Write a protein that binds this ligand. Structure first.
Ligand SMILES: O=C(O)c1ccccn1
Ligand SMILES: O=C(O)c1ccccn1
Ligand SMILES: [Fe+2]
Ligand SMILES: [Fe+2]
Ligand SMILES: [Fe+2]
Ligand SMILES: [Fe+2]
Lengths: 174, 174
């Protein structure tokens, strides 16, 4: 059977879910309990965490523009997602997506992670660039598994303290 | 490093590869040697084989219209991919994509299959509906692993012969 339902018009779906593609929610997963995790992410949203995904991430910036702050070869780099761009991110490339525009929409496709394959979330020192804190998580549900992780970092000067230079990371906004 | 390169404009890429999105080639994979197999499929193309994919298939019909002939719950059914539609096909749902329109373009995303996880290709009797022939294949490369499979079916009245009613399947065109 068609477990995931029939085909349906994507622009219409995006328009119908526009109220969820903005703060405070910001994103909406298309199908539940599927192997391919298909999400539409809107904006505005800025963030300071880097994601270490053990599998690939596919991006197709449908409306508006965004960018990914990356670590590439030990250096801070930026990959721009201009409207119309597609991009495939290799496993483990650290990325912090920034989505400054309201009304923007990006198709992001990932795979469910197998048991034992963990995701990392990391923060780096604005002053010296050293890793400040890393949490590894078995990501089963984004909604329940992820926000408390972020909240616990923001609430803790210990977690936010750079082990190299001692500077306390700002937390939620940089 | 960005193994798969930087982001790039998708409509421009599709326009630049338009000569490959029509007979005799018909499709073009976007990135090589990636876990996510990302393809753009054009037209026109009609076919008689059903695919039994052990993993999910994601579709986004970007330009023009297409449709999938399916077996759902023991009955012949059709899922239309109208321009703008997205669709997620569950594993093992038999599907025969038909792409009647020139200039059409559909984003199709699949995963590389692990060793031991095989794809099936099947043909069914137009008269009685019984399975006529099935081949299982470890799909490593579409270009080399798949066309000879199809050719060997078309060239063989034995393979094309229905075991229930004896009718010889037409082969390439129905
Ligand atoms: O939710 C994710 O997995 C993700 C996607 C893009 C950038 C950072 N994180
Ligand atoms: O190439 C495939 O895996 C495929 C895709 C869609 C329909 C039939 N086959
Ligand atoms: Fe990510
Ligand atoms: Fe520091
Ligand atoms: Fe298929
Ligand atoms: Fe038959």
């Amino acid at each position: 059977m068609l477990t995931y339902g029939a085909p349906f018009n994507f622009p219409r779906w995006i328009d119908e879910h526009a109220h969820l593609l903005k703060p405070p929610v910001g994103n909406r997963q298309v199908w539940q309990d599927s192997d391919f995790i298909v999400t539409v992410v809107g904006g505005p949203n800025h963030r300071t965490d880097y994601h270490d995904d053990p599998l690939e991430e596919f991006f197709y910036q449908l409306r508006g523009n965004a960018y990914l702050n990356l670590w590439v070869d030990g250096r801070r780099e930026r990959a721009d997602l201009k409207e119309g761009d597609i991009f495939l991110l290799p496993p483990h490339v650290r990325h912090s997506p920034q989505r400054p525009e309201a009304g923007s929409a990006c198709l992001v496709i990932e795979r469910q992670r197998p048991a034992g394959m963990l995701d990392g979330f990391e923060w780096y020192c604005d002053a010296c660039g050293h890793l400040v804190h890393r949490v590894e998580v078995q990501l089963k549900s984004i909604v329940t598994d992820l926000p408390p992780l972020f909240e616990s970092f923001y609430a803790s000067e210990d977690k936010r303290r750079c082990p190299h230079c001692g500077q306390v990371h700002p937390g939620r906004a940089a």
